[PDB]
Design a protein around this ligand. Structure first.
Ligand SMILES: CCOc1cc([C@@H](Nc2ccc3c(N)nccc3c2)C(=O)NCc2cccc(S(N)(=O)=O)c2)ccc1OC(C)C
Ligand SMILES: [Ca+2]
Lengths: 250, 54
């Protein structure tokens, strides 16, 4: 996260840290006790699927305070329409091997209904983006979870305000063109959370952009409203052997 | 009518003919006003406990 602030401990309780062999891979969002929503691109280079860990209740990477809960990722579900090395359909649904325990520090973010997300949430101007990604372009990643407030743009306005992959109906722009504030590569998969009438909802996933906080460029986020039914149907399905699952989209 | 101001609903809105029904995400219940959602669980989704308990 560029130009944000530390998320005070316990104020981003749905934030997930994805690890591969103990190394920082991506972020994610907890949506209930067993399911995590992340970006499909986070898994393009995985070879050791058994080394994939999700950490909940994480805040500061330098210390263990006892609120962290780590779980093995039993399944990574990616839409059939996602093509590795490309930008479209950048979403992954992760099944944890064992449920996490909900506490003051571990709470799911609401996965909204499609209608409510399209008709209402899509019009809330500002939303929060978070992660332990780069604090600057070509800079070090954060030790404490960072949060940033970003305004959402209409796709026409984003193309007209920008100085390249297309911005599809499965994406949206959010952020600033001045080079001061953005989510970065290490934030990938993390939440874009929207507040509405006292409750926070999942509206986007940190997906892509052109370098972090680059002048004339906005952050690009997976438009989660397009996947609500895809996600819901998968959550009601029985697990299948194998870690990686490609599921038909739509 | 759900298209306009979320049909007055705090969370989800369903159109029914001419008729509107508000709904809530799991871990919440709809109040008698027919619009408000109240938590039914200790850790409802999208609420920050350190902030709620403050
Ligand atoms: C769909 C992923 O697309 C991409 C992801 C990233 C980079 N992530 C991010 C995330 C949020 C950002 C933001 N808000 N602002 C600025 C830059 C940002 C970069 C990342 O993860 N890299 C490592 C990486 C992992 C896996 C596959 C591929 S890819 N798609 O470039 O082959 C890149 C960069 C370029 C991408 O696509 C190109 C084609 C424009
Ligand atoms: Ca820690």
């Amino acid at each position: 996260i560029v130009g944000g602030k530390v998320c005070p401990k316990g104020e981003c309780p749905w934030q997930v840290l994805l690890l591969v062999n103990g190394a920082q891979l991506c972020g994610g969002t907890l949506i209930n006790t067993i399911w995590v929503v992340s970006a499909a691109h986070c898994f393009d280079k995985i070879k050791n699927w058994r080394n994939l860990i999700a950490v909940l209740g994480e805040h500061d990477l330098s210390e263990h305070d006892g609120d962290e809960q780590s779980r093995r990722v039993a399944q990574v579900i990616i839409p059939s329409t996602y093509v590795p090395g490309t930008t479209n359909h950048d979403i992954a649904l992760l099944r944890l091997h064992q449920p996490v325990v909900l506490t003051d520090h571990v709470v799911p973010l609401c996965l909204p209904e499609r209608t409510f997300s399209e008709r209402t949430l899509a019009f809330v101007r500002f939303s929060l983006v978070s992660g332990w990604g780069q604090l600057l372009d070509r800079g070090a990643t954060a030790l404490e979870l960072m949060v940033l407030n970003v305004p959402r743009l209409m796709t026409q306005d984003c193309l007209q305000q920008s100085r390249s992959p297309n911005i599809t109906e499965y994406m949206f722009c959010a952020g600033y063109s001045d080079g001061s504030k953005d989510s970065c590569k290490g934030d990938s998969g993390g939440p874009h959370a929207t507040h509405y009438r006292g409750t926070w909802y999942l509206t986007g996933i940190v997906s892509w952009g052109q370098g972090c906080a680059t002048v004339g460029h906005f952050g690009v986020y997976t438009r989660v409203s397009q996947y609500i039914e895809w996600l819901q149907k998968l959550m009601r399905s029985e697990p299948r052997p194998g870690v990686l699952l490609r599921a038909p989209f739509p | 009518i759900c298209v306009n101001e979320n049909g007055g609903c705090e969370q989800y809105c369903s159109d029914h003919t001419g008729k509107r029904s508000c709904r809530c995400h799991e871990g919440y219940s709809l109040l008698a006003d027919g619009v408000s959602c109240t938590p039914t669980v200790e850790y409802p989704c999208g609420k920050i406990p350190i902030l709620e308990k403050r």
